[PDB]
Design a protein around this ligand. Structure first.
Ligand SMILES: CCCCCCCCCCCCCCCCCC(=O)OC[C@H](COP(=O)([O-])OCC(O)COP(=O)([O-])OC[C@@H](COC(=O)CCCCCCCCCCCCCCCCC)OC(=O)CCCCCCCCCCCCCCCCC)OC(=O)CCCCCCCCCCCCCCCCC
Ligand SMILES: CCCCCCCCCCCCCCCCCC(=O)OC[C@H](COP(=O)([O-])OCC(O)COP(=O)([O-])OC[C@@H](COC(=O)CCCCCCCCCCCCCCCCC)OC(=O)CCCCCCCCCCCCCCCCC)OC(=O)CCCCCCCCCCCCCCCCC
Ligand SMILES: CCCCCCCCCCCCCCCCCC(=O)OC[C@H](COP(=O)([O-])OCC(O)COP(=O)([O-])OC[C@@H](COC(=O)CCCCCCCCCCCCCCCCC)OC(=O)CCCCCCCCCCCCCCCCC)OC(=O)CCCCCCCCCCCCCCCCC
Ligand SMILES: CCCCCCCCCCCCCCCCCC(=O)OC[C@H](COP(=O)([O-])OCC(O)COP(=O)([O-])OC[C@@H](COC(=O)CCCCCCCCCCCCCCCCC)OC(=O)CCCCCCCCCCCCCCCCC)OC(=O)CCCCCCCCCCCCCCCCC
Ligand SMILES: C[C@@H]1CC[C@@]2(OC1)O[C@H]1C[C@H]3[C@@H]4CC=C5C[C@@H](OCCC(CO[C@H]6O[C@H](CO)[C@@H](O[C@H]7O[C@H](CO)[C@@H](O)[C@H](O)[C@H]7O)[C@H](O)[C@H]6O)CO[C@H]6O[C@H](CO)[C@@H](O[C@H]7O[C@H](CO)[C@@H](O)[C@H](O)[C@H]7O)[C@H](O)[C@H]6O)CC[C@]5(C)[C@H]4CC[C@]3(C)[C@H]1[C@@H]2C
Ligand SMILES: CCCCCCCCCCCCCCCCCC(=O)OC[C@H](COP(=O)([O-])OCC[N+](C)(C)C)OC(=O)CCCCCCCCCCCCCCCCC
Ligand SMILES: CCCCCCCCCCCCCCCCCC(=O)OC[C@H](COP(=O)(O)OCCN)OC(=O)CCCCCCCCCCCCCCCCC
Ligand SMILES: CCCCCCCCCCCCCCCCCC(=O)OC[C@H](COP(=O)(O)OCCN)OC(=O)CCCCCCCCCCCCCCCCC
Lengths: 80, 29, 129, 52, 35, 62, 103, 78, 135, 85, 43, 43, 231, 78, 78, 78
């Protein structure tokens, strides 16, 4: 998949079909982070860097910073 | 336009000459 | 006008079927069987829960105030708490500015009568605004 | 080891320089005169009355 | 295992590079990123 | 050279990496400055400078 | 083993690089520097007023005049120059006094 | 008698003339791609190589159009 | 004999500031020393996060510099020329008046060449002050 | 005009002025100080390198006899084409 | 482009065969070879 | 590279370790089977 | 007059120090042709044909740090002056030319006299030699002029389009709430498309112009190289 | 004597000239498609890769036409 | 009567006219690369040799544009 | 009435018009080399002779360009 121009790398298969069919999948040994692993969304279960901090919260934080940058002089103007 | 100007061309070109004679060796090594 | 509506409905149906949430699918099936609206029911449930949790919010507020005043909050202070406090301060500042703008009901400070800018007010193209 | 130490010191110096340039250094020849120098002459003769 | 780096590659694929022979090939047929 | 790295699948994943967290904060700043300019520079109480015809850059550069 | 880039210090490597690796380029660069400082190192006051200021020349304070005034005051004070000399004024001191009494 | 006149509006005329140079450049670029399509259909095995040469030609041809456009800005902003 | 031409002539011990240097190298190496971080002529790396972090920071500091140091000069010139031609005359105004004038300057900047020209061209019959107001 | 103004260096800090006469004279003083000592004979290549080219250029300037007028290099105003003075 | 090999003494044509602006400057006109630039170029 | 141990592994490094680690064959098989199923469903 | 200023690379210098205190491989180069001049084996040159590699790499690094990063708004191309680029190209081109001339091999210039003995020497071949000698200097001038003009035009266009986009976005976004919202949406989508297209075009053109800038110098060098065959 | 004159309507003239720059752009685009048909007719299996390149050529040619059009509208509003 | 007039904005017109010469140079370059792309597909083994000749034409074709560009500056800055 | 006027700025227009003549020279050179590339692929064994003839054609076109520049410089100065 892509996010703007950034494309998610994909691992090339190395096993042939015959050898691949003989592989037994045991997700019990997999880490909890990667279970029901999906190439199209591998980070769905990945933990958040900060608990309770959503992406929308950061977006709103940036918007608030912009609003401050544009409106602070309106409330606390300073002379030349 | 300053890009077509010459009233301070020497000082302006000192940047390139410094890069060539002093910074290129550091990048080289 | 009709083909577009059918296409939008089909896309929404595909997306609704795509989700693999057991609770959401179960609620959707139950409401479809009963012919009711799931989203409205969820809204009413949330409003009822909030109505029943008001005094819980009050108690939590007092407990948090005691926790902060006691100094226990700063004893275990970490970088994450610093990040949250910075977010909190930013929201406080922006809210203060918005409150001032609304309080004076004008983006810019009003012009005093003795200011030389009064002419601009006199020369408004549309006095109504 | 040598390069790591040298680059650490260079990084500190460049950080200080960047801060000073982009947040403290005023631009020369300001219209109001409130910030920055307007230029001045140097290498002026001194103690050479015969020069004039 | 650790998070340490390894022999640098330069963002190159060794199965098609001009010096691919210098990189050993494993059983799976993938040339190594290093000697 | 755009070879690899963490790539969030959607908006909600931007919080799974500090670098993308900073990126989304910056994007929020970028996009939210425009509405701020809309509100500030299209305000009812905004008034043109009475002395705007006293001087302008057009006469200066001319 | 010995290598210029790895064993020599930075100034030594710089001299070696620009003397035994790129000497002609260095010579041309020095020539061009000399030319630039010999023919492109002057700016008249009018040129400075036209293009020498970011937002425009602030005629309301004329910093060029103040700069020249400081320059000339410093020169006169340090060099002990008698600006009342006839060559500067074109007239004798007595004529200067007569003019001062007249005006 | 000696009379000196300075017409301001002439800079528009010169600016428009320079824009005409883009007619050749735009046409020239289309010529390159036209040959590219007629060449890829004659030897598709080299399509990637041809596409590379086509792009190089596009820039060189495009570079000239920028020269004219620069003059347009110079006179339009002076 | 006075100074050595060889880099081997050490001036400090091998353990001088080892810890801070190791921390700095850890900062440098974690994201850059990777297979996917293939640079194009040392200037364009392959790690996406490097772009995502560096572009906003560069833009932020450049914009701060431009706003607080460069455009400020134009704003001050406009205020001075339009309100007396002297700094003291501008300072005679209040902070709110200066704010209004500076925001009008921002309006003019935003309009540029794509906007109404009455902002700098005085229509005939206008009662507002002309260019010779202070002359 | 405004778009053209965006192509200027953004980190100008200080400007210094100096007359050509003053620093040329100072350079001549330094050159004389370093070439004066007896242990540098006049026939040395270093001394000739220091002096001969300058002497040749100055002689060429003095010998010059031009029918046209060359305006002063360091006038106050050199932007008026119809006023060489 | 390619390497240059100087001609042998026997591969050099005689001077009399060279042509000037108008014609060959043979006997009774050899001293005019000095002044004819085109003859020198052809030689 | 002991000085890097404090930094640990990020999401991308954990993904790479999981995919190319000792469980690489299982992950490859699962991913290929899932992709084949999705392709078949699409057709 | 002595002006003290600084380049706009201090942060990039800091990043170079931080990320290159340890070695890293380089496999992608803008101008790779400076390393592979000879393609047929057993051919070798006694001239220092590989002397231009270091200068090429450094010039690529410098111009890439400046031009590519200039797409970021408010980033300054400190060296963007016509005569400064002229000085740079003069240095490089004339240095290589004087390296060839100091060799004191006049036969090296035999190829300047274009044509064969059949063509008239004075009226055809000599004029062609004059034109080619002029064309060398014209190639130098064209290189520097192209490098200057490409950047100047690209950035002028970017500034103008960004100004227009700012104007329409700020002073006409209210149309979203009005009955003519569709027109504004169409215009906004077109502006976004144009923004993306311009950025991609500039990114590609900067690298391509650097490639051409180095290729002109390499062509100058190659025009006077002679290869011997091993036996 | 010093006389300064400001002619208003000249901006119409300059704008019209820039419009002529679209003649080559329109012709160039038509050339690309004409060549595309021949390539498709002489190599019918490559009906998509050729189409993509034709679109790419059109985009670049359109870009040149848009650079000129910016001046055409800008002078018309100057 | 003898009247001398000096119109001070005419150099813009001459500069634009000289800039128009760039259309032919751009078109010629596009023609060269169009022939190159359609010629490589015919004799790919000699691709490299053709490219060298193509650049030579560009070197001998871009130079002419410089003369016209040179005149523009000599009149734009005078 | 008899009125004699001498406009000092009309030589710029003439210089620009003469410079337009180079558009044909540039295009002619492009045509020469475009055919040269095609011919070389057709019969590569005659590359040198074709190159010689192409140079001859370029010279003649360049000679015409010199004549146009001569008129341009004369009017520009005189
Ligand atoms: C200067 C001062 C002036 C002061 C004036 C006075 C001020 C007021 C004083 C008091 C007056 C008396 C009280 C009046 C109250 C009236 C409101 C009320 O009670 O609402 C409850 C009522 C629901 O009550 P209910 O039916 O009992 O609910 C039962 C359940 O609880 C249902 O539960 P639920 O689970 O459903 O809960 C969700 C529900 C409940 O949520 C809410 O309660 C919402 C908020 C309620 C207050 C709304 C006030 C609105 C007042 C005007 C706008 C002010 C700003 C509002 C900002 C809201 C932000 C969210 O959400 C909604 O209501 C959704 C509404 C939005 C639907 C969006 C669908 C758009 C489809 C478009 C398709 C187009 C296709 C075209 C194809 C063409 C092809 C040719 O909701 C509404 O009426 C919603 C109205 C929303 C209007 C929005 C208008 C925005 C402006 C126009 C759009 C411009 C931008 C976009 C243009 C795009 C191009 C076209
Ligand atoms: C066995 C003994 C054991 C002793 C154990 C002792 C243990 C305890 C520690 C001892 C105490 C500390 C010792 C010093 C440590 C220094 C730092 C360090 O460790 O560095 C790493 C390293 C440690 O040594 P190592 O690795 O063991 O061995 C070194 C290698 O052997 C050779 O290295 P390399 O050749 O590879 O590289 C040397 C150098 C290349 O070589 C040079 O550069 C040397 C030559 C430079 C000349 C520059 C001036 C030229 C002027 C023009 C000429 C004037 C002529 C005048 C003639 C007379 C006129 C009358 O490389 C560099 O330039 C890159 C490194 C630069 C470092 C960064 C500097 C800035 C840091 C700023 C931090 C603070 C920021 C502000 C904070 C503010 C807070 C509010 O040391 C160096 O690399 C040495 C760097 C020296 C730089 C000197 C620059 C001077 C600039 C200012 C001049 C002021 C002049 C004023 C004149 C006024 C007139 C009015
Ligand atoms: C004690 C030192 C030695 C004393 C003398 C010893 C015995 C004689 C030595 C040889 C003398 C050669 C005479 C001329 C030969 C023919 C060439 C020619 O035509 O020359 C014209 C003219 C000389 O005039 P002249 O023909 O003798 O007759 C006078 C005429 O009446 C004037 O007529 P004009 O119309 O030509 O006048 C225009 C103007 C024309 O003036 C110019 O155009 C000046 C050109 C300067 C060229 C510099 C060459 C070296 C460049 C190295 C690479 C730099 C890269 C970029 C770096 C940028 C950032 C710093 O003339 C002047 O005012 C001449 C003043 C020259 C002052 C030289 C000061 C050099 C400072 C170097 C600073 C380097 C900083 C590096 C910092 C690195 C830190 C890590 O300029 C020169 O010859 C320039 C080169 C002078 C070389 C001197 C020996 C080496 C340097 C020793 C001092 C080092 C100081 C370091 C300070 C560090 C502070 C941090
Ligand atoms: C009168 C007012 C004052 C001014 C007087 C001026 C006199 C002028 C005389 C006439 C000259 C005529 C010709 C002028 C032509 C100019 C052309 C020009 O500008 O071209 C642009 C061009 C721009 O080049 P660029 O591409 O920007 O790169 C050059 C950069 O320097 C960056 O290049 P880079 O990074 O490649 O360079 C290597 C770099 C490698 O990287 C590093 O090393 C990193 C650090 C970089 C430093 C340099 C950047 C500076 C950034 C801005 C300033 C920083 C903050 C300063 C704060 C000042 C506060 C007032 O290393 C260094 O820079 C070595 C020096 C490191 C110093 C470290 C000192 C540590 C001290 C620690 C003390 C601790 C005490 C503890 C006590 C405890 C007690 C208990 O300039 C040059 O190439 C250099 C032009 C210089 C010409 C010579 C001028 C004469 C020397 C003047 C020295 C004055 C010293 C006294 C000042 C006192 C304060 C007021
Ligand atoms: C190759 C290597 C690289 C590294 C390096 O070496 C070479 O590069 C070298 C390049 C150096 C910089 C070059 C240039 C400056 C600007 C300077 O700024 C002067 C500002 C002052 C100037 O004041 C005059 O001081 C004169 C003193 O005699 C007086 O006479 C004269 O009357 C008076 O006007 C103060 O300005 C006041 O500002 C105020 C408003 O704000 C107001 O008050 C008012 O506006 C104004 O007075 C501050 C220092 C700095 C950054 C240098 C640092 C050191 C270097 C980085 C060296 C470094 C070592
Ligand atoms: C090899 C190819 C590389 C391709 C890189 C592609 C990057 C894709 C970026 C997507 C959009 C990013 C948006 C960032 C927003 C930041 C905050 C903000 O407000 O920005 C507004 C700014 C400007 O947006 P604006 O114009 O809307 O600003 C409006 C502001 N007013 C109204 C005040 C004028 O955003 C940009 O300038 C983004 C342009 C990015 C172009 C690509 C640059 C690539 C070259 C630099 C690479 C650096 C890598 C360094 C790595 C380390 C090296 C050692
Ligand atoms: C894809 C869609 C979604 C995308 C989202 C992306 C982010 C966008 C976020 C948008 C945020 C709000 C945008 C604000 C737009 C401009 C607001 C403004 O200030 O405009 C009002 C302005 C008043 O000034 P006026 O008197 O008309 O003339 C001024 C001349 N000196 O007059 C005008 O400008 C004329 C406006 C006429 C049309 C009005 C339309 C809105 C009507 C309902 C508004 C209700 C708002 C309630 C908020 C209450 C605030 C206290
Ligand atoms: C040659 C001198 C002859 C006359 C005698 C002068 C003696 C002055 C008193 C000195 C006392 C302190 C000495 C400390 C040790 C100095 C060691 C030294 O010189 O090392 C040079 C060192 C750089 O060393 P490096 O190049 O890395 O390798 C060296 C090995 N080859 O460089 C450094 O790190 C800098 C060390 C500077 C130490 C001070 C030097 C002062 C010299 C002054 C000379 C002028 C006369 C002084 C007279 C004083 C009278 C009281």
């Amino acid at each position: 998949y892509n996010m703007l121009v950034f494309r998610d790398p994909k691992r090339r298969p190395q096993l042939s079909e015959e050898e691949r069919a003989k592989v037994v999948v045991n997700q019990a040994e997999w880490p909890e982070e990667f279970k029901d692993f999906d190439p199209d969304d591998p980070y769905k279960n990945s933990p958040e860097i900060i608990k309770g901090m959503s992406s929308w919260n950061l977006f709103l934080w940036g918007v608030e910073c912009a609003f401050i940058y544009q409106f602070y002089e309106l409330v606390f103007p300073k002379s030349i | 336009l300053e890009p077509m100007s010459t009233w301070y061309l020497a000082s302006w070109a000192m940047v390139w000459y410094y890069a060539f004679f002093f910074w290129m060796p550091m990048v080289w090594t | 006008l009709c083909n577009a509506a059918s296409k939008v409905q089909a896309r929404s149906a595909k997306k609704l079927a795509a989700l693999t949430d057991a609770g959401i699918q179960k609620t959707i099936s139950e409401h479809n069987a009963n012919g009711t609206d799931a989203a409205v029911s969820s809204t009413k449930r949330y409003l009822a829960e909030q109505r029943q949790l008001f005094h819980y919010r009050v108690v939590r507020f007092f407990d948090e105030c005691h926790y902060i005043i006691s100094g226990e909050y700063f004893a275990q202070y970490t970088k994450v708490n610093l990040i949250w406090d910075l977010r909190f301060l930013t929201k406080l500042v922006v809210l203060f500015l918005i409150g001032t703008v609304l309080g004076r009901q004008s983006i810019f400070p009003p012009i005093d009568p003795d200011s030389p800018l009064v002419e601009a007010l006199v020369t408004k193209v549309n006095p109504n605004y | 080891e040598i390069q790591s130490r040298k680059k650490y010191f260079q990084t500190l110096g460049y950080l200080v320089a960047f801060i000073y340039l982009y947040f403290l250094m005023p631009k020369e020849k300001s219209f109001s005169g409130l910030s920055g120098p307007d230029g001045h002459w140097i290498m002026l003769p001194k103690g050479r009355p015969e020069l004039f | 295992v650790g998070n340490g780096p390894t022999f640098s590659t330069g963002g190159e694929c060794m199965n098609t590079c001009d010096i691919q022979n210098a990189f050993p090939m494993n059983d799976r047929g993938v040339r190594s990123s290093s000697p | 050279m755009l070879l690899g790295g963490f790539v969030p699948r959607r908006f909600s994943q931007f919080n799974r990496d500090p670098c993308w967290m900073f990126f989304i904060f910056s994007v929020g700043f970028w996009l939210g400055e425009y509405p701020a300019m809309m509100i500030k520079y299209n305000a009812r109480d905004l008034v043109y400078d009475p002395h705007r015809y006293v001087w302008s850059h057009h006469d200066d550069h001319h | 083993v010995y290598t210029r880039w790895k064993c020599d210090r930075l100034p030594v490597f710089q001299l070696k690089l620009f003397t035994q690796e790129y000497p002609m380029h260095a010579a041309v660069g020095i020539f061009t520097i000399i030319f630039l400082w010999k023919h492109m190192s002057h700016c008249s006051e009018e040129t400075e007023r036209k293009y020498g200021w970011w937002a425009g020349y602030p005629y309301w304070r004329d910093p060029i005049a103040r700069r020249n005034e400081t320059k000339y005051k410093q020169m006169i004070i340090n060099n002990d120059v008698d600006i009342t000399h006839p060559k500067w004024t074109g007239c004798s001191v007595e004529q200067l006094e007569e003019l001062s009494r007249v005006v | 008698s000696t009379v000196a006149i300075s017409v301001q509006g002439l800079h528009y005329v010169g600016t428009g003339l320079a824009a005409i140079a883009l007619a050749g450049v735009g046409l020239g670029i289309g010529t390159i791609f036209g040959n590219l399509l007629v060449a890829c259909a004659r030897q598709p095995n080299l399509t990637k190589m041809l596409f590379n040469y086509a792009i190089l030609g596009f820039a060189l041809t495009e570079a000239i159009g920028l020269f004219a456009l620069m003059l347009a800005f110079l006179m339009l902003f002076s | 004999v006075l100074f050595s031409t060889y880099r081997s002539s050490r001036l400090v011990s091998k353990e001088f500031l080892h810890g801070p240097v190791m921390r700095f190298r850890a900062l440098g190496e974690y994201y850059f020393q990777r297979a996917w971080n293939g640079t194009l002529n040392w200037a364009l790396p392959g790690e996406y996060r490097l772009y995502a972090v560096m572009i906003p920071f560069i833009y932020f500091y450049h914009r701060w510099h431009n706003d607080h140091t460069l455009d400020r000069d134009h704003v001050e010139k406009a205020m001075i020329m339009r309100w007396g031609g002297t700094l003291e005359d501008v300072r005679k105004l209040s902070a709110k008046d200066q704010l209004r004038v500076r925001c009008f300057t921002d309006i003019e900047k935003l309009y540029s060449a794509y906007g109404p020209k009455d902002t700098y061209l005085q229509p005939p019959g206008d009662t507002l002050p002309g260019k010779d107001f202070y002359r | 005009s405004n778009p053209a103004d965006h192509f200027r260096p953004n980190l100008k800090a200080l400007t210094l002025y100096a007359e050509r006469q003053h620093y040329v004279d100072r350079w001549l003083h330094v050159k004389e100080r370093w070439l004066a000592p007896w242990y540098l004979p006049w026939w040395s290549p270093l001394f000739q390198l220091g002096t001969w080219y300058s002497q040749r250029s100055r002689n060429l300037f003095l010998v010059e006899n031009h029918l046209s007028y060359r305006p002063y290099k360091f006038r106050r105003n050199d932007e008026d084409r119809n006023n060489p003075y | 482009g390619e390497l240059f090999v100087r001609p042998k003494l026997e591969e050099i044509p005689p001077a009399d065969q060279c042509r000037g602006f108008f014609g060959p400057l043979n006997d009774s006109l050899k001293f005019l070879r000095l002044l004819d630039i085109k003859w020198m170029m052809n030689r | 590279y002991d000085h890097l141990a404090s930094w640990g592994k990020d999401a991308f490094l954990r993904r790479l370790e999981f995919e190319n680690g000792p469980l690489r064959d299982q992950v490859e098989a699962h991913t290929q089977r899932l992709l084949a199923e999705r392709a078949a469903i699409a057709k | 007059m002595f002006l003290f200023f600084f380049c706009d690379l201090f942060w990039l210098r800091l990043l170079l120090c931080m990320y290159y205190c340890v070695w890293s491989r380089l496999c992608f180069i803008v101008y790779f042709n400076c390393l592979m001049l000879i393609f047929d084996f057993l051919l070798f040159c006694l001239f220092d044909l590989y002397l231009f590699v270091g200068l090429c790499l450094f010039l690529l690094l410098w111009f890439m740090l400046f031009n590519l990063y200039s797409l970021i708004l408010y980033y300054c191309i400190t060296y963007l002056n016509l005569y400064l680029l002229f000085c740079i190209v003069f240095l490089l081109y004339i240095a290589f030319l004087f390296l060839f001339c100091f060799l004191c091999d006049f036969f090296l210039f035999n190829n300047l006299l274009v044509g064969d003995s059949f063509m008239d020497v004075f009226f055809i071949r000599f004029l062609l030699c004059f034109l080619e000698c002029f064309s060398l200097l014209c190639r130098c001038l064209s290189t520097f002029l192209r490098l200057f003009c490409n950047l100047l035009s690209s950035h002028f266009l970017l500034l103008m389009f960004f100004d227009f986009f700012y104007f329409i976005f700020v002073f006409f976004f209210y149309g979203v709430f009005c009955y003519w919202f569709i027109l504004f949406i169409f215009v906004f989508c077109f502006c976004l498309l144009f923004y993306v297209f311009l950025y991609l075009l500039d990114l590609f053109a900067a690298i391509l112009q650097l490639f051409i800038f180095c290729n002109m110098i390499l062509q100058l060098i190659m025009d006077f190289l002679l290869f011997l065959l091993f036996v």
